[PDB]
Design a protein around this ligand. Structure first.
Ligand SMILES: COc1cccc(OCC(=O)Nc2ccc(-c3nc4ccccc4s3)cc2)c1
Ligand SMILES: COc1cccc(OCC(=O)Nc2ccc(-c3nc4ccccc4s3)cc2)c1
Ligand SMILES: [N+]
Ligand SMILES: [N+]
Lengths: 188, 188
C-alpha cells in the first residue's frame, strides 16, 4: 500500500500525460515517498505501468469468467462485450498507455498477447457451442472468426477511447460492435 | 532517382530491421551517395519512411478508385478488400514500420488518419447505395458500421502480416474479413 499509493498516482498522472512525461520522482512525490523508496517497490516507471495494465486485464478477465459461469443471443454477446467496454472504459489512461507500450515493451506485448489468446479461445468455444446446438451456422472456422472479432474490438475501442480520428463515438461503439458480432456469428 | 535509390534501400533495409536500427549512413551507403548528399533529398530517416508510406497508401487508394469507377455482392467486397491485402501485403516492412511510426510521428499519424477517413467515407457511400437500391437492410448508421469494418481490417491485416500472436494466418485472412463485411452489411 505504499505500493497501492504508487499505482494510484501513476494512474492519475497518466490521465494528464504519457508515461515518458512522467518521472520516477513524479511517482515518488505523488505517493508520498522518496525515490530510493520507490525503487524498492518497482524496478522502473515501466514496471508500474505493467502492473496497472496487469490489474486492468485481469479485472476484465475475471468479469468475463463470472458471466461465463451462468436472455436472447444478441443480449448475451452484448453483456460480454460490455465487460471490455466498461472495464477498459473505466481505465482509459491505463488502456491508452498499455496500448502504446506494446511497442516499447516485450513484457507489455506478452501480457496483452496472452489475454487476447485466452479471450479468443473463449469466444471460439461459445461459437462452437452455438453451432453444436444448431443456433449458429457452420461458416468460417470459429477460431479465425473469433480472432478477427476480438481484434476489431481491441482496435475500435482503443480508437473510441482515445478520441481518434477516425473513431466510432463512444456512445455508439457498443451497439456498433454487437451488430457486427451477431450478424457475423449467426449470419449466412 | 538518387531519391528513388534512397527509397528502395530504405524499403530493403526495413525487411531486416526496424527504422531505429537503420542509420542515415546506412541509407546513404545503400543508395551509393554520401551522407550530406542524403540530407539534400531528405531531412531525416523518418522523412524517408513517411515518403515510402505515402507512396504505399496512395497506391491502395488509386487502386480502390480504379475499382470504384466500374459480379455478386460478396465478390464485389472481396475485390475491394483485396486491394488492401495485396497492396499492403506487397509492402509488409513499410506497412509494419508505418504502423509503428503512428506513435512516433504526427505526420505519419495524420497521413494514416486522412486515408482511413477517405476509405471509411467511401465504404459508407457504397453501403448507402446498397441500402437505396434495396439490396442491404437499414441497420446501423452506415458511417459507424464502415468505421468499425475498416478499423477491423487495419488491425487484423497488420497482425497477420506481422505474424502476431494472436493473428489469422495470412492465407485465411481475406476470406475471414470478407465473411464479416458481407454478413454485417447485408445481415439483419
Ligand atoms: C481496449 O478494448 C479491448 C481490448 C481487447 C479486447 C477487447 O474486446 C474483446 C471482446 O469484446 N471479446 C469478447 C467479448 C465477449 C465474449 C463473450 N461474451 C459472452 C457472453 C455469455 C457467454 C460467453 C461469452 S464469451 C468473449 C470475448 C477490447
Ligand atoms: C494494413 O491493412 C490495412 C490498413 C488500413 C485499411 C485496411 O483495409 C481497409 C479496407 O479493406 N477497406 C475497404 C475495402 C473495400 C472497399 C470497397 N470495395 C469496393 C468494391 C466495389 C465498389 C466499391 C467498393 S468500396 C472500401 C474500403 C487494411
Ligand atoms: N465506461
Ligand atoms: N500479398
Amino acid at each position: 500500500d505504499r505500493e497501492l499509493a504508487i499505482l494510484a498516482t501513476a494512474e492519475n498522472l497518466l490521465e494528464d500525460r504519457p508515461l515518458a512525461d512522467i518521472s520516477v520522482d513524479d511517482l515518488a512525490k505523488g505517493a508520498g515517498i522518496s525515490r530510493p523508496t520507490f525503487y524498492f517497490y518497482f524496478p522502473s516507471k515501466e514496471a508500474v505501468l505493467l502492473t496497472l495494465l496487469d490489474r486492468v486485464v485481469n479485472q476484465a478477465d475475471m468479469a468475463l469468467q463470472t458471466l461465463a459461469e451462468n436472455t436472447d443471443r444478441e443480449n448475451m454477446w452484448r453483456t460480454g462485450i460490455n465487460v471490455f467496454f466498461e472495464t477498459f472504459g473505466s481505465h482509459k489512461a491505463v488502456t491508452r498507455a498499455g496500448q502504446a507500450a506494446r511497442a516499447t515493451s516485450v513484457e507489455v506485448a506478452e501480457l496483452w498477447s496472452t489475454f487476447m489468446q485466452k479471450w479468443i479461445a473463449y469466444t471460439a468455444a461459445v461459437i462452437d457451442a452455438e453451432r453444436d446446438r444448431g443456433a449458429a451456422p457452420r461458416t468460417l472456422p470459429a477460431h479465425e472468426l473469433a480472432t478477427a472479432l476480438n481484434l476489431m474490438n481491441e482496435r475500435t475501442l482503443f480508437a473510441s477511447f482515445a478520441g481518434e480520428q477516425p473513431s466510432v463515438p463512444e456512445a455508439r461503439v457498443l451497439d456498433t460492435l454487437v451488430h457486427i458480432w451477431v450478424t457475423s456469428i449467426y449470419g449466412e
